[PDB]
């Protein structure tokens, strides 16, 4: 287990950038990491976005959030650019304006201030 609960993550998610997260305990597990069904260690987190949401990601999709000048060294994992589409973009600021202000906070500040709620 590399990641904890509050811990800011960078995820890389079917066909989107990699995307400014917060490690959290999934809902109905109660956990925040688990072995998959392919024998994998995934992390569960919560997406920073006008739009909530969740996933489990693969420890491999994963990677610790030092800050957003750190997007350019997860692209590079004539030169060539995917183009980036300005709705999806927008979304994208506002993740990171959230997660630039979490990074400022200690660990149970950011789970207090982030931590969503889940309605059955
Ligand atoms: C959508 C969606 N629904 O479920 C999941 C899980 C996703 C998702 N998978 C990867 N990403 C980065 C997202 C996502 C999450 C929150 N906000 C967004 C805003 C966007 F513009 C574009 C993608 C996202």
Redesign the pocket.
């Known amino acids: 287990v590399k990641f904890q609960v509050g811990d800011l993550v960078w995820?890389k998610?079917?066909?989107?950038?990699w995307?400014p997260c917060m490690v959290s305990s999934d809902p109905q597990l109660e956990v925040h990491t688990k072995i998959n069904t392919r024998g994998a260690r995934e992390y569960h987190v919560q997406?920073?976005?006008?739009?909530?949401?969740?996933?489990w990601v693969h420890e491999k999709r994963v990677r610790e959030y030092k800050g957003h000048k750190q997007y350019e060294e997860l692209l590079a994992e004539q030169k060539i650019r995917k183009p980036r589409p300005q709705?999806?973009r927008?979304?994208?600021d506002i993740?990171i304006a959230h997660a630039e202000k979490a990074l400022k906070m200690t660990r149970e500040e950011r789970i207090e201030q982030y931590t969503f709620i889940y309605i059955d």
Do not use: I, K
């Open positions: 995820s998610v079917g066909t989107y950038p995307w997406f920073f976005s006008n739009q909530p949401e969740r996933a709705r999806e927008a979304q994208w993740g």
